[PDB]
Amino acid sequence: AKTTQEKFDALKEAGVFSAYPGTTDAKLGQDMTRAEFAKVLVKLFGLKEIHGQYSYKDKNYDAKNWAAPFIEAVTAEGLMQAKDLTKKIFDFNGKITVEEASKTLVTALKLEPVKDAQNKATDWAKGYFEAAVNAGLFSKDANPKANATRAQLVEAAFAADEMSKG
Ligand SMILES: CO[C@@H]1O[C@@H]2CO[C@](C)(C(=O)O)O[C@H]2[C@H](O)[C@@H]1NC(C)=O
């Protein structure tokens, strides 16, 4: 049974995960931005980067933003969307939460959100989070509302990859 560090090392060699920005450290206890996680999803699921399209109005979300091709890909794929459909705000620099990551992976894996889900998650996410817990993507005592640690994201990505091979 691989450790989180072993899983990270496998995913890093595969080009799916990177070290913590500006370092060579895995920093498994640190958090991850929504921008960085969009890139993880693109690499994990083999999505095509989308250049020259901008679906959001966040300040400094434009052609100079390195993450736009990744964010656009996960948007086109239906994995991520805005937090605010009026102002069209993705919150690219906000940290990805456990329940947000759960939605992306449940969606990519074509798992059914759980009806009548009763758990700690924000209302919109209860079904997604429950499906992710039931599939072993996050541990049962993970806080859906917390920022996901890099460890948790490695564990979840690794399990998603295992579920995508066949
Ligand atoms: C606060 O609104 C929620 O925002 C969530 C942000 O995280 C993800 C995973 C996303 O699509 O990026 O899920 C979003 C939720 O669907 C929800 N957004 C909307 C428009 O209902």
Q: Determine contact, residues 74/47, Cβ cutoff 8 Å.
A: yes
Residue 97 in tokens = 């939460």
Containing 154, the helix (H) or strand (E) segment is: helix 150-162
For 5-61, give the secondary structure using H, E and C. HHHHHHHHHCCCCCCCCCCCCCCCCCCCEHHHHHHHHHHHHCCCCCCCCCCCCCCCC
Report resolution in angstroms.
1.2
Containing 72, the helix (H) or strand (E) segment is: helix 68-76
Q: Which atom of ligand 1 is nearest to 99's Cα?
A: 9
Angle of the 98-108 helix axis to the 126-134 helix axis, nearest 10 = 70
Distance CA 41, CA 115 (A): 25
Distance CA 21, CA 30 (A): 11
Burial class (CB in 10 A: 0-12, 13-18, 19+), 113: middle
* 147, β-bridge pairs: 97
Q: Which residues of 35-49 are buried (b: 16+ CB within 10 A; e: fewer)?
A: bbbbbbbbbbbebee
* Ligand 1 pocket: which of 84, 103, 104 to mutate (most atoms within 8 A of CB): 103
CB of 81 closer than 6 angstroms to any ligand 1 atom: yes
Residue 76 in tokens = 């086109």
From atom 15 of ligand 1, which residue's Cα is the shortest distance away? 83
